[PDB]
Every structure is written in C-alpha cells, then in structure tokens.
Amino acid sequence: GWVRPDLGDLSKVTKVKTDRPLPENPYHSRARPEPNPEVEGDLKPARHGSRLFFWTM
Amino acid sequence: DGPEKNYERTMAILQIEAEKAELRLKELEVRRLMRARGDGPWFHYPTIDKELIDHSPKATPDN
Numbered sequence: 826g827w828v829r830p831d832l833g834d835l836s837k838v839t840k841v842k843t844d845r846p847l848p849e850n851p852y853h854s855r856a857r858p859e860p861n862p863e864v865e866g867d868l869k870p871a872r873h874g875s876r877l878f879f880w881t882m
Numbered sequence: 883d884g885p886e887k888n889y890e891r892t893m894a895i896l897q898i899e900a901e902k903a904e905l906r907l908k909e910l911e912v913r914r915l916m917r918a919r920g921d922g923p924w925f926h927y928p929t930i931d932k933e934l935i936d937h938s939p940k941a942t943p944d945n
Contacts, residue, residue, distance in 0.1 A: 861923075872905060
C-alpha cells in the first residue's frame, strides 16, 4: 500500500508531537550583565552655560 | 553707584562663580568615575549590536 510521495512533499516543514519538554537554556548561557541605568527626565538648559573658563554663556 | 548696589552686585557675582566652580569640580569627579567603571553615558565604547545575529535553524543542528 505504499504510495511514493509527490515532487516537493519530502521538503515540507512538518509539525511533530513530542513529550520531551522544550529545553529551557539550550546554550547553557550565564545570566546576562545588567544594563546601565537609563538616563531619563526633561532636558533643561545647562547651568550658567558652557562654564568654559571665563565665558558667561 | 552707591555702596549697597556694588555690595549686593558683588554677592550676585560671587554666587554665580561659586556655583560654577562647584560644578567644575563635580564634572571632573564624574568623568573620573565613568571612565574607570564604564557604567555611565560617557566613555561608552560601542560593542557589537546583537540584532545582527541570525537565530534561524541552521543547516546543521549543533550551533
């Protein structure tokens, strides 16, 4: 009763039932480093300007 | 100008200059920490962007 699969059939992506649980950390990665604290808030003009030597702006 | 105007004009000048001087000393201290520890927005030398990585199943399994 075997029917030869048609052109293109064996290259299909199929779905399989399995009881093996999905691996949680397949790469065995360490915990990632914490990101640097975000800079937030409203942008305000610089206090007394550039403050470069004698410049007042 | 009377002595009072010059006196209180001096205080206004001194306040601004004292505030700038403190900020100048604070900026140097902040720069020293950021460059030593790399935990700030400054001296943030770029690393490779991880969105460049391809996470698709590869031609072979072990990778």
